[model samples]
Target: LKRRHYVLQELVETERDYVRDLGYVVEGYMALMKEDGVPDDMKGKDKIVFGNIHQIYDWHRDFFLGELEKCLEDPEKLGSLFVKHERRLHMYIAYCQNKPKSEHIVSEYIDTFFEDLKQRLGHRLQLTDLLIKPVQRIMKYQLLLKDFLKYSKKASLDTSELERAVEVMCIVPRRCNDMMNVGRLQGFDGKIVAQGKLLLQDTFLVTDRCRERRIFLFEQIVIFSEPLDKKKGFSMPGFLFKNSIKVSCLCLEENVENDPCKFALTSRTGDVVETFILHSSSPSVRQTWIHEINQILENQ
Candidate 1:
C-alpha cells in the first residue's frame, strides 16, 4: 500500500507538470466538462469551450488531475488504469500542440502488461493482428533500403560494364572464395558472359567496419576495364561512379584494432592487387577515397 501510494503521488505530480509543460492549465472550471467525458454529440466542443491557449491549458490540467486522483484512491485495482489515463493525457497534449502524427503517443501499457504477465505466468500471450501489421510494415521498409545499392546506377556504364565495375570492388571474406585468387581475368569473363557484353570501369569496394557492424565504409579509385559498347576499347563509364556505393554488415567482433588487408584494381595491369598496411579503419581515409572516386566519375 505504501509503495502504491508513493508511485501514485509521483505519477500525479509528473503528469501535472507534463501536461503544463505541453502548454495546458492545471485547473479551471472547463476541466469539469472533460472529466464528464466528451460525448459523441459534444465532439469538437473544445474549439468552443477553450478558445484561447490559457483556457485549453487550464481545462486539460484539471481533467488529467481529476483522472489521476481516481487512480490514487485505489491503486491496486487502478494502477494500470492510471497508466492508460496518463497516456491519454500525453496524447491529448500532443494533439493540442499540433505535433506530427508520427509523434503521436501510442498506448504501450497493454503490451507491457501482457509481457509482464507472460513472464510471471511462464507462458506466451497470443498477439493481435494489429501488432503484427506494424512490424511487417517496418520489415518491408528495411528490405527496400538493403537492395537500394543493387539497382542504383551511379554514372553511365552499360549493364555489363556496370556489373564488372561493381564486382571489382566487392570484397570476399577470407574464409569464403576470395575474388583475388580467381584472378581479374576470370572475374571479368564471368561477369561479362552472365550479363551479355557490358562495359566495365572504375568501382568502389565497400566493407563493414570490423569493430562496429552498424557502420559501413568503402574505398574508391580502383579501375578495371570491360568492353566499351562491345567495341573492345575501354572508356570511363561516367562521372559520379563512386557515390553510388553503399554497404552494410553486422560487426562480428567487439574490438577491431588490427589493420585489415586492402584490395585495389589496377587498370594498367588489368589485375586486382592486394596490399597490406593500408588503414581502411580511418574515416578520413574512407572519405578521401570516396571523394576521389566521385571526382573521377564526374570528370569523365
Candidate 2:
C-alpha cells in the first residue's frame, strides 16, 4: 500500500508539471503568436508551428489531470482511465505525424521570430524544446504506469487492473513513437497511413547488389532504403529511400536453399523476373516476416 501510494503521488505530481509545461505553449507562445509575436511574413505558418498542441493542452490540463487525481483515492480506476482513453491519445500521433513539417518551419525561423519570442519571454528553452513536451509526456506515461504496476505487485494488490493500464500506456506511446520514426523517413511522399499500416521494418542483409539496407514491410508494399549515418542535431531522415515493390507483385520464397534464417522476395513483372535475397539475423525474425507476408499474400 505504501509503495502504491508513492507511485500514485509521483504520477499525479509529474502530470501536474506536465500540464504546466503544456501551458507554456498553449497560453504562452500561442497566445502571444495570435497577437504580435509573429511577423506578417510568418502569419499562416504559425498554425503548422503549433500543430494540435492546444487540444493536447486542454485535455491534459482540463480533464486528464483531474481524472488521474481521482485515481489517488480509487487506484483501480487507474487502469481503465488509461484503457478508455487509448483512442483519445491518438491526438499525440496526430501531433507527431505533423512534427516533421513543424520542425522544418521552426528551423527556418529559429534565428528570427523564434529568437525574438524567446527573448521577449526571457525563457531558457526554445520553441522546439517546448513543442516536444507532448511527445515526451506521452512516452513518460508508460514508464510511470509500469512503476505503479511494479509497486502494486510487491504490495500484493490486485495487479490485474494495473497490468491492463500499463499495457495500454505502452501501446499508445509506441504508436506515437512509430509515427515519429515514419515522420523522419526521407522521400516516399505517399500517404503513409493509407498504406494499410506498417507491418514491420528492420535492417537486413539485402542483396541489392549485396549490401545492408533498411527494409520497410507495408501491407501494400515493401520499401528498401539505406540507413543514413548519424549526424549532429537531428534533422535529416534516418533512412533514404532506394526502391520499393508493391505487395500485389510480390512473391515470397520462404526457404532459401535450406538456410534457416534466410528468405527471398521475387519481383514478377509479366515475364520480367527479379529476385531479392535477404538474410535475417535470426530464425524467429525470418519466421515472423514470412508469416506476415504470407497473410497479406493470401488476403490479397
Candidate 3:
C-alpha cells in the first residue's frame, strides 16, 4: 500500500545515511590509512584494533548494504531486515565485547590518525564519533520498524509482520545496548566484561573512611574504587584497578551506628579481607542498593 511504502522508504533512507556515515571508518579513512601506510609507530595491539573495526566495517559495507539494497525490490523487506541479519549482527556484539580490550589502542589511533582522517574526509565526523557507527546502526533498525508499524496501522494494513519485526529488533538492541555500555565503560583497568553486565556504578560516600569511593556491581564481582577523573579532554583515565571482589560470599550489611543508609561491604579474597562502610544519603536509596545486591545474590 502507499502508506507501507512511505514507512519502508523511511527505513531505506535512514540506513542510507547510516551506511554513508560509516564510510570514513570502513571506507575512505581506513583505505587512505593503508594507502599512506599505517604509521611506523603503530604497534601490535594498535594494528589489531584497526583490523577488528575493518572486519565489522567490511561486513557492514558489503553484506549489510547488500541486504538493505534488497528492500528496493521488496520494500516490505525493511521490516524483516534486522531479524534476517540478527545472527550476522552478532558480529557487532562480538565486536563490542572485544572492544574494551582494544579501547586503549583505538584511543591512540584516533589521536594519531583522526585529524588526518578529518583532512582526508573533508571534516565529516569526529574520529571517535565515526567509530560509533556500529553502535548507532544496531539501534536504528528498531526505530525504523516502530515508525513502519505506526504508519502501517494508520493505513489499516496487517500489522503482524511489523509486529514480529519490532519484537526481534527490540530484544536485539537491548542486548546490544547493554553490551555497548560495558564496552564504553571507560577507565577500569580490569577485564570488565568478565565481571558480567555492570549492575551498578556511581559515587558513594564512605563512612569514617575517605568519603570518596565509587562502586561497580557486576553479576560476578562487586568493586570499589577511587573514580578515575580525566583531566585531559580526550584521553580517558583508566579504571584504577583498586578493588573488585568476587560476588560469591561477599557480605553487605546495613548496620551502622546511626545512619540507616550506612552499610558495610565485607569482601574476602583467599586469606585477605576488606570491608567498606558506604552511605548513600537516604534509607530508600540504601534500600534500593540493598535490594539490587540481594537480587544478584539470589540469582546465584
Candidate 4:
C-alpha cells in the first residue's frame, strides 16, 4: 500500500515537471519566435521545428495535468484516466510522426538561427534540448505506467483497466520509435509516410553472405535494409535501404527445410521473381513475422 502511494505521487510529480519542460519550448522558445519573427531562410521551416507542440502543451497544461492531479485523490481513477483519453493521447502520435522532420529542421538551423534565439531568450537549454522533451515524455509515460501497474498488482488492486493503460502507453512510444526509424531510412524512392503504418521492425539474419538486415514491416510494404550502426544510438542515417517487397506482390514460405526459426519470402515485381531466406531470433519471432505477413496478404 505504501509503495503504491509513492508510485502514484511520482506519476503526478513527474507530469508537473513534464508540463514545465514543455513550457520551456512553447512559452519560452516558441513564443519568442512568434514575437521576434524568424529570418528569411527559417521563415517557414520554423513551424516544422515545433510541429503541433503548442497543441500538446495546451492540452496537457489546461486539461491532462488536472486529470492526473485528480488521480491522487482516487487511485482507481488513474487507470480510467488513461483509458478514457486514449484518443486524446494519440496526439502524441501526430507529434511523433513529424518528429523526424522537426529534428532535421532544427539541425539545419541550430548553429545560426537557433543559437541567436537561444541567447536572445536568456534560456539555459538549447532549443534542441527543449524540443526533445515531447519524445522523451512519451517514453517516460510508458515507464511510469509500468511502475504504477507493478505497484497496483503488488497492492492487490483491481488491475484490468491499468493493464490496458500500460498497453496504450507502450504502443504509442513503439510507433514513435518506428516512425523515427522510417525517417532515417535512406534510398527509398517513394514517400515514406505513403507506405502506411510501420507494423514491426527487427534485425534478421539473412542467408546471402551471412548478412544481418534490419527489417521493417509496414501496412503496405516491407523494407529490408543494412543497419548502419553496429550498436544503436540517437543519430542520423540508421538504415540503408537494400531491398523491399510490396504487399501486393509478396509471398511467404515458412519453415525452410523444417527449420522453425527460418522463413522465406518471394517477391514478384514485374517479370522478376526472386526468393530470399532470413533467420529470426526465435521460432516465435518467425511465427509473428509470418502472422503479420499473412494478415497483410489476406487483407489484400
Strongest candidate by lDDT: 4
Q: Measured by TM-score, how close is model 2 to the native structure?
A: 0.89
Model 4, position 209: C-alpha lDDT score: 72
Q: Model 3, 173: alpha-carbon shift in Å?
A: 3.1
**List of clashing residue pairs for candidate 4:** none
Q: lDDT tens digits, residues 134-211, model 4?
A: 888888888888988898888777999999999999877887777777777878889887998788898889874779
Please list the C-alpha lDDT of all candidates, in the order they appear: 0.31, 0.82, 0.67, 0.84
Could you give candidate 2's per-residue lDDT for residues 51-78 as a string of tens digits? 9999998998889999999988888899
lDDT score for residue 22 of model 1:
32
Candidate number with the higher TM-score (2 or 4): 4
Which wins on TM-score, candidate 1 or candidate 3? Answer: 3
Off by over 4 Å in 1: 24-62, 82-300
Could you give candidate 1's per-residue lDDT for residues 1-300 as a string of tens digits?
A: 344345446656755654544331213223443565544554664443333434335554667457646756644333244233333323233222221111111122225532443354343322221222222322332233223223333422234532432232231111011111112221222221232211122223334231211111223223222211211111111121111221111112212253332332222222433321223445555445445544444543
Worst 10 residues of 4 by lDDT: 229-238
Q: Return the lDDT, model 3, position 124.
A: 59
- Which ten residues in a row are the worst by lDDT in model 1? 230-239
Candidate 3, 248-275: lDDT as tens digits: 8688776777688688888777888888
Of the pair 2 and 3, which is ahead by lDDT? 2
What order do candidates take by TM-score, descending? 4, 2, 3, 1
lDDT of 1 at 238: 14
Better of 2 and 4 by lDDT: 4
